[PDB]
Design a protein around this ligand. Structure first.
Ligand SMILES: [O-][Cl+3]([O-])([O-])[O-]
Ligand SMILES: [K+]
Length: 131
């Protein structure tokens, strides 16, 4: 069979969606197409790159993409990673297989917060693999 698709969307495509794309590529590897996008495109966060390098995953070559409506409707799973009321949580079309996995925004915080969120995102993806 062909690969299934998981889309990790958020307020931006800088930290949480990028660390999720990173863990998604490594854990869900051969059976899943793992993309990520955001409402805002602020580039790939420097501390998220460094946090993922600490666990031997390279995300420095990821792109900062905007949310494309075609991929939302065609995915097997769309995961919103925003904090359900911060500012700018994604707009989703009907019949789109969605799920909400909330994680705190580490933007502007110390390196330790990127570490904490990285490992919460890891555990979530590891739990997802064995469903
Ligand atoms: O994915 Cl985020 O850049 O919103 O953390
Ligand atoms: K991306």
């Amino acid at each position: 069979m062909d690969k299934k698709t998981i889309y990790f969307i958020s307020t931006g495509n800088s930290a949480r969606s990028q660390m999720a794309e990173g863990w998604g590529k490594e854990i869900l590897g051969e059976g899943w197409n793992v993309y990520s996008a955001g409402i805002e495109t602020h580039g790939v966060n420097p501390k998220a790159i460094e946090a993922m390098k600490e666990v031997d995953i390279d995300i420095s070559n990821h792109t900062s993409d905007l949310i494309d409506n075609d991929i939302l409707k065609q995915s097997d799973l769309v995961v919103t990673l925003c904090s359900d009321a911060d500012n700018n949580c994604p707009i989703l079309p009907p019949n789109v297989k969605k799920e909400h996995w909330g994680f705190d925004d580490p933007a502007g915080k110390e390196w330790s917060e990127f570490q904490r969120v990285r490992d919460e995102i890891k555990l979530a993806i590891e739990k997802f693999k064995l469903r």
